[PDB]
Design a protein around this nucleic acid. Structure first.
Lengths: 133, 268, 180, 246, 93
RNA sequence: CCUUCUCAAACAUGUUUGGUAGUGAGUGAUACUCGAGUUAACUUGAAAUUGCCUUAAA
């Protein structure tokens, strides 16, 4: 049949987990609110899921926001069928980079890059390329 | 810096490699320079400002000359300030750049970018049709938010900051001189946050191999003083690389006024 | 009513034009009717002076506007400058309520009270609409009286003000009184 | 509560936080004074006067006397923690409130941070005297009273017994010390309560709504939010502003 | 503001304007000629026969239409007291 | 139902330094440096089904 799970898509830039929870708390109590986000950066994928304690409240929210024009986005709201619980939506942050350790010594890495240069020379000879050294 | 005979032989071999007998027949003839640095070029902070490398031989004029027989012709976009868009017209550029054969197709501003091309699809369609994008150095800092991130995924669609103001006032002569200097002498290179720098030299049909040799020699001579480089490679698309430089010693580098103001404004 | 209609329809430019094309009432004919004689006006301007000097010292609230306060202060400064230039003061008295001045104006004794320059507190138990109506009447009366006094004494009305002197000290010295 | 309002508030708050973060990073670099990469390294004052002219000059570094008026901030913006802390320390927690500020090199970045919520000007002597003689209030504790209450600055004897150690006798001496920025200037400034001004437009009739429209247009014309992390401190005609607001 | 344009044209001797199209006969003709991008039809029209045929005509001509509440609202749109219909024909980029 | 860093100094109109961190999804080859960082270019309606402070007040 139908569950108490609401699938929302075509969400604007400012619509996130806290905004969705605050807006749909007026429709009803929310068990869980999640938003699809990129893994490497803290940017939404413009869709998410909410769970209502009352499936009647979920249906009312869907029939209220199914074709709502919001900041140039026509929001799309659906009621998920029976079962199919929501899972695996971690709230990612903007990941940072850092330089790690280099345990290979100077002599060993020079030998490795010399071996890679020799491998390149062998590949150039193999591929019918006549170049010096 | 670079042996003349070695680089001439490499360029001739790579231009022989292309001529063995969609985009398959077109994308494979672009020369690329790979610069491998011991450290990151910028560091911990990203950079979108393209570095301008000066060479003796023109690069963009051959692009305009050879783009007449292509579906996507060479186009120039100019982005200037809203308060200074009224001081310049198409005829102002025509009568000052007609002798050099330099034509600026379209001049827009921030208001145009925020109103006419605000939508993503229209903005992409407008941006992708231009090859050389020049931007005022004052407004170039607002461009990542206005033009979007897709324009920064390619070298040609990344705007070039130019000096347009003389004596803190708008200068048509200075603007035209900067446009001419960029069009004739300098080439843009995108600085990554990694160790691999890619330089697009152009197309084999655009320039002679000796002119490519001169350009790459001057690029290497400038970049040796610019950075503590490690390796230099020359390649063509869908082809292997050929090294041209080697050094060792540069690898040896591998291994409260706010509270005072608060206290000043506070009683105790 | 028409301005409300324009604002409700959303024609802001039309509303601005309607506001520009309006004329307000004046009390000059009522002043002439009530005081046929300049000696009668001189005899009665004492209450006007008291009211204007009281209202010039008040701060601006929701009921009393800065424009009205500035008008009262300007006309009080003009009266003080005229009295100081023509050298007509006769008696002074410094009481705990304020400073009473008695001057000779066209052969008649005029006694008025000036408060001290302190932030007096509004009681919010008086009829401010009635007081403002009286203030408008007194402002018109004192405008007529001051114009006639300046013309009879041979001085330009209204006198011009020195902006830098007013920014130094906003007093009676700001207005420089000229001849002919 | 409408989702459009929630999203607009979130976006505006995010932009304000980004601006404050950029300003904080730049001012930390300036305080360190050993940073190779920086956009600019000095302080700019932009005076806007009245058909309006703008003059941008370099701050000489000498201390100045500023009058600061708290206004309603940008639309749908929640005030971040740093700006809120600076405003609370400056005693500008509500609009139509004015204070005096000793502008110095450490004070300039605070003005940069709290720029979109304040109007900053150079007050004249007549404006200062009018402000103190018209709206002067203190918090005073009586000998027979358990809890102090706010009163108007009407007694010179109270000033004599409260600030007589520093050499302050009366309201005229308070005015002189504030204007000259001498000793005990901060003492007098915090002895005086922040000045509670009145709005230039009040009411909701047709005339007052038209006046509000004109006022908002003029405010948008004068006050401009650069949001560039290096914006000059805006200085307006505080004399005319005080004439309208007092 | 029309008089401001006429004086400016007299001194020279103006760009292409964009405006909401209104008037019942004009809008019906635009719908029949397929020039109207969007049509708004007031719901409280008396007599109703003036607009009772408009949805079917818009459906047959393939013109997007919407019934809206308030001929007074459409009148405020087109600087009138009332307006039975409004139409958007050409728009800016 | 908000609206986007619209620039500085040094030298003599010129030269140099710094300033620019983005809608999402998908296709992809090809090389470079130690699961990390980079590297030819193509599509898309602002597309989408789950990688653990209150006078802008009633």
């Amino acid at each position: 049949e139908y569950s108490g799970i609401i699938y929302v898509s075509r969400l604007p830039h400012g619509f996130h987990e806290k905004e969705l929870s605050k807006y749909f708390a007026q429709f009803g109590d929310l068990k869980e609110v999640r938003l699809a986000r990129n893994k490497k950066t803290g940017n939404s994928r413009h869709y998410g899921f909410l769970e209502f304690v009352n499936k009647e409240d979920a249906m009312i929210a869907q029939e209220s926001m199914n074709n709502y024009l919001l900041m140039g986005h026509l929001l799309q709201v659906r009621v998920l069928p029976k079962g199919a619980k929501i899972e695996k939506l971690y709230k990612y942050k903007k990941r940072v980079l850092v330089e790690k350790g280099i345990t290979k010594p100077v002599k060993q890495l020079k030998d490795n890059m010399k071996q890679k240069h020799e491998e390149r020379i062998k590949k150039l000879a193999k591929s019918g390329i006549e170049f010096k050294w | 810096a670079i042996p003349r005979e070695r680089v001439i032989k490499a360029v001739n071999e790579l231009i022989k490699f292309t001529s063995k007998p969609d985009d398959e027949e077109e994308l494979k003839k672009d020369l690329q320079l790979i610069v491998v640095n011991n450290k990151s070029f910028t560091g911990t902070s990203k950079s979108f400002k393209l570095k301008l490398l000066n060479v003796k031989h023109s690069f963009y004029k051959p692009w305009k000359e050879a783009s007449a027989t292509a579906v996507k012709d060479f186009k120039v976009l100019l982005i200037l300030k809203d308060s200074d868009i009224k001081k310049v017209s198409e005829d102002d550029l025509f009568d000052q750049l007609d002798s050099e054969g330099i034509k600026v197709d379209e001049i827009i501003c921030g208001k145009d970018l925020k109103t006419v091309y605000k939508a993503y699809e229209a903005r992409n369609a407008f941006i992708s049709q231009f090859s050389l994008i020049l931007a005022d150095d004052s407004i170039v800092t607002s461009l990542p938010k206005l033009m979007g991130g897709k324009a920064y995924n390619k070298v040609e669609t990344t705007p070039i900051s130019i000096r347009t103001h003389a004596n803190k006032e708008f200068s048509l002569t200075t603007l035209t001189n900067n446009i001419k200097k960029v069009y004739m002498n300098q080439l843009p290179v995108k600085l990554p946050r990694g160790t691999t720098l890619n330089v697009h030299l152009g197309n084999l049909e655009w320039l002679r191999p000796e002119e490519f040799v001169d350009n790459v020699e001057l690029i290497s001579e400038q970049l040796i003083k610019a950075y503590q480089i490690r390796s230099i490679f020359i390649k063509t698309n869908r082809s292997p690389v050929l090294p041209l430089y080697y050094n060792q010693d540069v690898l040896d580098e591998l291994e409260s006024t706010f509270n005072k103001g608060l206290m000043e404004i506070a009683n105790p | 009513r028409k301005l409300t209609r324009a604002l409700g329809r959303g024609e802001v430019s039309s509303a601005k034009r309607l506001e520009e094309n309006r004329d307000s009432y004046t009390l000059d004919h009522i002043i002439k009717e009530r005081y046929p004689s300049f000696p009668d006006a001189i005899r009665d301007i004492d209450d006007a002076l008291n009211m204007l000097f009281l209202f010039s010292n008040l701060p601006s609230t929701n009921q009393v506007s800065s424009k009205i306060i500035n008008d009262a202060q300007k006309i009080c400064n003009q009266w003080l400058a005229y009295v100081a230039k023509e050298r007509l003061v006769r008696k002074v008295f410094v009481s705990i309520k304020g400073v009473y001045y008695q001057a000779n104006i066209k052969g008649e004794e005029v006694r008025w009270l000036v408060p001290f320059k302190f932030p007096e507190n509004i009681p919010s138990d008086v009829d401010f609409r009635i007081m403002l109506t009286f203030l408008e009447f007194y402002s018109t009366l004192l405008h007529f009286v001051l114009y006639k006094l300046y013309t009879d004494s041979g001085l330009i009305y209204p006198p011009k003000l020195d902006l830098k002197k007013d920014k130094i000290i906003s007093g009676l010295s700001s207005y420089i009184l000229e001849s002919r | 509560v409408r989702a459009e309002s929630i999203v607009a508030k979130t976006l505006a708050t995010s932009r304000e936080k980004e601006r404050i973060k950029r300003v904080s990073i730049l001012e930390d670099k300036k305080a360190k004074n050993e940073t190779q990469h920086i956009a600019s390294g000095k302080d700019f004052i932009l005076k806007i006067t009245e058909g309006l002219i703008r003059e941008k000059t370099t701050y000489d570094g000498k201390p100045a006397l500023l009058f600061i008026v708290r206004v309603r901030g940008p639309l749908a913006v929640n005030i971040p923690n740093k700006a809120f802390k600076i405003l609370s320390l400056l005693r500008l927690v509500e609009t139509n409130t004015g204070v005096f500020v000793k502008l110095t090199k450490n004070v300039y970045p605070l003005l940069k941070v709290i720029a979109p919520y304040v109007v900053i000007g150079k007050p004249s002597l007549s404006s200062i005297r009018s402000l103190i003689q018209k709206r002067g209030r203190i918090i005073y504790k009586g000998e027979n009273e358990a809890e102090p209450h706010e009163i108007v600055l009407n007694d010179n004897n109270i000033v004599e017994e409260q600030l007589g150690d520093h050499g302050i006798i009366c309201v005229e001496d308070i005015i002189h010390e504030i204007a000259t920025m001498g000793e005990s200037f901060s003492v007098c400034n915090f002895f005086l309560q922040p000045f509670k001004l009145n709005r230039e437009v009040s009411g909701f009739g047709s005339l007052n709504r038209l006046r509000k429209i004109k006022q908002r247009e003029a405010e948008s014309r004068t006050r401009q939010f650069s949001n560039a992390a290096t914006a000059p401190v805006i200085e307006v005609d505080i004399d005319s502003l005080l004439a309208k607001l007092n | 503001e029309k008089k401001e344009r006429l004086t400016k044209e007299a001194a020279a001797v103006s760009p292409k304007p964009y405006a909401v199209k209104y008037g019942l006969n004009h809008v019906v003709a635009l719908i029949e000629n397929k020039k109207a991008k969007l049509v708004l039809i007031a719901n409280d029209v008396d007599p109703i026969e003036l607009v009772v045929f408009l949805p079917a005509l818009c459906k047959k001509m393939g013109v997007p239409y919407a019934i809206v509440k308030g001929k007074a609202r459409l009148g405020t749109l087109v600087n009138q007291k009332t307006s039975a219909v409004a139409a958007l024909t050409e728009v800016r980029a």
